[PDB]
Design a protein around this ligand. Structure first.
Ligand SMILES: [Br-]
Ligand SMILES: [Br-]
Ligand SMILES: [Br-]
Ligand SMILES: [Br-]
Ligand SMILES: [Br-]
Ligand SMILES: [Br-]
Ligand SMILES: [Br-]
Ligand SMILES: [Br-]
Ligand SMILES: [Br-]
Ligand SMILES: [Br-]
Ligand SMILES: [Br-]
Ligand SMILES: [Br-]
Ligand SMILES: [Br-]
Ligand SMILES: [Br-]
Ligand SMILES: [Br-]
Ligand SMILES: [Br-]
Ligand SMILES: [Br-]
Ligand SMILES: [Br-]
Lengths: 291, 291
């Protein structure tokens, strides 16, 4: 049957506490930047990816994985905890202008029937937002992606991400975030995954105001991602976001990026990354309690 | 009565999981370095100190405080958790050659009877170790300090800390650590608080060997401090130390130094520092279990 429910990727409290490890070339660069020998082999990425999944998934309500480096491997090695659900990335990242994801399309070599058969409950689509690029073209992609999910009994998660325009120098990140939300905040996906306004920096009140503003333009449950926010400021970001209407997080770097390049990865993941994710889940439970 | 027992500063498992917030001028400099406005007022130090104590002491088996900035205040405001015991610093730090603690003596304006009356269970003495300074002079100080404690029913904690020599350029930190231990590792204190060899860096086996070597020269329970060790590598340092004979930690910077200078201190202490201390206590419990 093609019945799907948001309940399958939330905690008992109804909040979202989810782990993202689907980063690709972006992770190879992190490993390079931490002083791992180059060129960094693919097996280093899948090793770290499946380790992160097995050590951290006990603490997440879902985990987001990519076919390219660790989807096969995680099911093979039953790396995902029983209590944690599985999101599969359905975006094909295209490099350009010297960055690894300059453009994004829907991944055609994704078999939602296969993936559903392996216990997946949801797919995710990154959507690059540019002020001088066609909004209708974005919306179409999201629509195609929503059907791919829903017709297969899967949830639909979109991730609008704000980039400067192709021709021009007018780029106000904050406004762009809000403009993307106006556009895509009611596109009929099941979940909106969004950047944190002001990088979670500054004063709590200015943040609450910005997160409130944002929440106004999202007509579906939403969560914040950690990219851009310092890991120390992310716990607060989640509190403010949820006080403003957000229902949780879907975070990666703020959980495990600090550990890249250090000796004894499994121990590092256990002693450094795990207490952070644990705390974050405690926090969402606390905020759902306040509703 | 002047009966004292190590059990009063350990967890149920018998391991030491202790919190140090007695840093003085050294902390003012941290606040300065994090971009707090200057000159940094004393009240900023006691504010942070008592906040750290009230938020973190629930997770520690003891907490080390200083008269200068927060001993009065912590008792006044019942800042120390019931389950956590109280160590009071009994060292008078003397600045020199451009550093805030160039030399250390026993603090004479310490009333052990007063302090015991407020529920204190132990005192701590930093001992600066220099290869070209008189060992007998150090030992004497420790002896005086041991009596001050024991005659008042208090435990005795010493903290030998390794410094380069006054005249000369021959300084091998690792050897110095071991030489200090040879000298002071059987001085009749109740606890030895020591720097981590190799800054907790490198390969696990090289560390285990160095920690084993060290343990050989300490004839009392010992614990490691976090100064010098990156906070991410401290959880491992504790595992290796205890696998080598150490019974726990007495750490500060690796718990709370990252949070200095950030907005919303009480929240930062709760969301960032607390999960780290919690983990560390979990780790000592795990290692005592292995004995
Ligand atoms: Br749960
Ligand atoms: Br590379
Ligand atoms: Br790995
Ligand atoms: Br859960
Ligand atoms: Br990129
Ligand atoms: Br814009
Ligand atoms: Br900030
Ligand atoms: Br709150
Ligand atoms: Br490991
Ligand atoms: Br305990
Ligand atoms: Br200052
Ligand atoms: Br404070
Ligand atoms: Br305890
Ligand atoms: Br100093
Ligand atoms: Br030496
Ligand atoms: Br290292
Ligand atoms: Br171990
Ligand atoms: Br606060």
């Amino acid at each position: 049957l093609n019945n799907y429910t948001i309940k399958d990727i939330t905690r008992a409290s109804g909040g979202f506490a989810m782990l993202a490890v689907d980063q690709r070339e972006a992770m190879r660069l992190m490993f390079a930047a931490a002083g791992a020998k180059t060129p960094v082999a693919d097996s280093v990425l899948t090793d770290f990816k499946v380790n992160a999944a097995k050590i951290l998934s006990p603490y997440a309500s879902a985990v987001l994985l990519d076919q390219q480096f660790c989807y096969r491997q995680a099911v093979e090695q039953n790396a995902v905890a029983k209590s944690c659900a599985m999101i599969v990335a359905a975006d094909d990242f295209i490099p350009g202008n010297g960055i690894p994801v300059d453009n994004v399309v829907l991944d055609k070599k994704i078999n939602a029937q296969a993936v559903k058969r392996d216990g997946a409950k949801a797919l995710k689509l990154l959507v690059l937002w540019r002020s001088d690029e066609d909004a209708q073209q974005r919306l179409n992609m999201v629509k195609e992606f929503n059907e791919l999910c829903h017709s297969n009994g899967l949830l639909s998660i979109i991730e609008p991400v704000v980039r400067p325009p192709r021709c021009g120098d007018k780029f106000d990140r904050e406004q762009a975030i809000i403009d993307a939300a106006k556009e895509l905040g009611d596109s009929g996906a099941d979940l909106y995954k969004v950047e944190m306004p002001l990088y979670g920096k500054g004063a709590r009140s200015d943040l609450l105001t910005a997160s409130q503003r944002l929440n106004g333009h999202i007509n579906m449950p939403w969560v914040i991602l950690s990219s851009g926010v310092d890991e120390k400021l992310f716990p607060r970001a989640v509190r403010v976001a949820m006080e403003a209407g957000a229902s949780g997080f879907l975070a990666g770097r703020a959980v495990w990026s600090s550990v890249i390049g250090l000796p004894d990865t499994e121990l590092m993941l256990r002693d450094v990354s795990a207490p952070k994710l644990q705390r974050l889940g405690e926090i969402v439970d606390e905020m759902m309690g306040k509703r």
